[PDB]
From Swiss-Prot, chains B, C:
One of its GO terms (biological process) is retinoid metabolic process. Changing residue 21 to M: In AMYLD1; amyloid polyneuropathy; by far the most frequent mutation. Disulfide bonds: none annotated. Changing residue 80 to K: In AMYLD1; amyloid polyneuropathy. This is Transthyretin. It is found in: Secreted; Cytoplasm. The modification Sulfocysteine is found at residue 1. It comes from Homo sapiens. It is linked to Amyloidosis, hereditary systemic 1: A form of hereditary systemic amyloidosis, a disorder characterized by amyloid deposition in multiple tissues resulting in a wide clinical spectrum. AMYLD1 is an autosomal dominant form due to transthyretin amyloid deposition. Protein fibrils can form in different tissues leading to amyloid polyneuropathies, amyloidotic cardiomyopathy, carpal tunnel syndrome, systemic senile amyloidosis. The disease includes leptomeningeal amyloidosis that is characterized by primary involvement of the central nervous system. Each monomer has two 4-stranded beta sheets and the shape of a prolate ellipsoid. Antiparallel beta-sheet interactions link monomers into dimers. A short loop from each monomer forms the main dimer-dimer interaction. These two pairs of loops separate the opposed, convex beta-sheets of the dimers to form an internal channel.
Length: 111, 115, 115, 111
């Protein structure tokens, strides 16, 4: 699998568990087509979203459902979600670090 | 003006100058409709995007064109742009500052919501 | 004043108000000697720490007392404080803004160096 | 080993390799005593700094030598180093994300 998502909780200093993630790919008509989805495990990681065969070149959007994560913990956060948009032309790790009013995201791209 | 955008460059240690910013509001049909736009100033800030009259409660998307910023510096970036999506709330007086800190393969964003 | 400190709270989405900040300069014997101190204002900023006359080239440490900030909010934090250590440089006119974004188990800091 | 350090490079989107790390522990005389040191591997991680037996309660400082990292890559960075100071009373991962004029650090504390 060439695409992994990892999410951390900056309030607790812990993996962000059970975070829903939806991946979209831009279609030829310039609309966002559903591509894959899943949720983070107890380690805060989401593996197996796709395969090398399926993950063709394109423009991808990884939507991390941060609002649902915070609301399930009893917190009213600022953002609806965190959206990570990039073109793929190799392994991509999309990492996110979450706080109620702030997030950071980094891409680690390796061979 | 109830909405301000501030952008910093973590590679140069500077304001991110002349970054394009496009703001959208979610319409009744669930599509994003254009709302306001501009480019950050010499201080990395974008003021005057809207007014209290127009900035009614809704879901807003602030799109920061990070890819073009890095390409103008001759630097290869990862993301197409940075998007900040939030619901505004009129529970009392409120100003929203959307702050972003940019690196080629990483960004952070924070909301500073004050009275 | 060539040195400003700005602190934001990523949990509340607000300036970090009344945060203690202590600045030190490295002495000739390699110890940290006190240089300036204060507390952030209602805007999360600390102005007037020093003057161009006193802020000569050297190695400076800016210590931000994050632990006491979180404890005053009733929130359990990880770090004792956040420290920012850098060498100043008089190559032309220069102002340093040390910005910090705080969460209980994480922080980021950026230097904005302008003319 | 109860203490791991992980470093990422936000310019390249890669692990930060060969980053020197020095850990200190506050002694009874309130001075910083050397505790352990090492450097990050090709994965950006530093394992085996200490043992459960050696890592007693105390105040620890993890100094990540960011200036030497950037200078070895031909870049003049802002900070001398990144310093992470915390009290230990369990596994600690100290993560850092580096840019020439900025860094972020997070603690992930697990059982």
């Amino acid at each position: 699998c060439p695409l992994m998502v990892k999410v951390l909780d900056a309030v607790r200093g812990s993996p962000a568990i059970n975070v829903a993630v939806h991946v979209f790919r831009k279609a030829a008509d310039d609309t966002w087509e559903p591509f894959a989805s899943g949720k983070t495990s107890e380690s805060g990681e989401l593996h197996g979203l796709t395969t090398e065969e399926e993950f063709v070149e394109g423009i991808y959007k990884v939507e991390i459902d941060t609002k649902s994560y915070w609301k399930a913990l009893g917190i009213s956060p600022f953002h609806e979600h965190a959206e990570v948009v990039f073109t793929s032309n190799r392994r991509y790790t999309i990492a996110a670090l979450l706080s109620p009013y702030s997030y950071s995201t980094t891409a680690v791209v390796t061979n």
